């Protein structure tokens, strides 16, 4: 999912 | 061209990456083409070329939605998160990045992932098939076109793709560089500061057009066509709209083995 994408995204940016 | 600070400056940034890649990407091309052509005598895949075989190999296949297509594509992409974070975490040690906006950061990635995948998949496939079940099995490509539609549209446009990335022949070494060029893609939609995000690539672009020149003497083009084949990759991805579109219109049974549906799951 677009939005399930970018909070894998954003957690792995952490 | 001259050794001088510059080029220098420019190998030093290919071996960051290439280290970086190293360190990031434990599936490496060189181990993917060794298991490919029958070298890895440990590692032997078991070959899935029609339904019989299919049943043969029920025990190296390893275990919601609807439809059939829809729990594929969620499982794919569930398969794909170890994936997406190696590709986040490489993307950390490209110089420059964590520096941008924290927004682009995340939508140069969320466009960037799709494309990276494909070009790890490629590493998996060749003109027969395309390995499975972490080197396990190999589906051939044949068997894949075969099965019903909408499955069997699936595959082959990327097939399509990867021989013709494959006949390339690029190392771990280019492709690392390559991968980069695909991140810092200033076009992306949503994009704030896209001046910034070009500065970075103009110099990954500098560091790929020196690395093929000294890595690859028999292809002049190299640097054209290796940028041609972006364009390929955007739009397989886009190819992924139509298919869902497909997949709505579709009357027919759209009923799959589930050691099928597992396959699926495993590619992209
Ligand atoms: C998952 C599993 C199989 C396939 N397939 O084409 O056979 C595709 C997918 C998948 O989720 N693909 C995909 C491509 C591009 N963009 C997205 C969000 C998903």
Not at chain 2, 136 to 154: A, I, V, Y
Not at chain 2, 199 to 217: F, G, R, S, T, V
């Amino acid at each position: 999912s677009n939005l399930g994408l970018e909070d894998i995204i954003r957690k792995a940016l952490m | 061209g001259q050794l001088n600070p510059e080029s220098a400056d420019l190998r030093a940034l290919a071996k960051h990456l290439y280290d970086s890649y190293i360190k990031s990407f434990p599936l490496t091309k060189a181990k993917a083409r060794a298991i490919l052509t029958g070298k890895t005598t440990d590692k032997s895949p078991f070959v899935i070329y029609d339904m019989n075989s299919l049943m043969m190999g029920e025990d190296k296949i390893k275990f919601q939605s609807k439809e059939v297509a829809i729990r594929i594509f969620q499982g794919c992409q569930f398969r794909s998160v170890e994936a997406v974070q190696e590709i986040t975490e490489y993307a950390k040690s490209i110089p420059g990045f964590v520096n941008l906006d924290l927004n682009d950061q995340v939508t140069l990635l969320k466009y960037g992932v799709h494309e990276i995948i494909y070009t790890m998949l490629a590493s998996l496939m060749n003109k027969d098939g395309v390995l499975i079940s972490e080197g396990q099995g190999f589906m051939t490509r044949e068997f894949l076109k075969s099965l019903r539609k909408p499955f069997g549209d699936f595959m082959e446009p990327k097939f399509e793709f990867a021989v013709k990335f494959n006949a390339l022949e690029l190392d771990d070494s280019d492709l690392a560089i390559f991968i980069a060029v695909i991140i810092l893609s200033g076009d992306r939609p949503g994009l704030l500061n896209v001046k910034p995000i070009e500065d970075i690539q103009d110099n990954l672009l500098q560091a790929l057009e020196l690395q093929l020149k000294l890595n690859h003497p028999e292809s002049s083009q190299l640097f054209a066509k290796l940028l041609q084949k972006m364009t390929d990759l955007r739009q397989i991805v886009t190819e992924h709209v139509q298919l869902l579109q497909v997949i709505k219109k579709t009357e027919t049974d759209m009923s799959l083995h589930p050691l099928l549906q597992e396959i699926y799951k495993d590619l992209y």
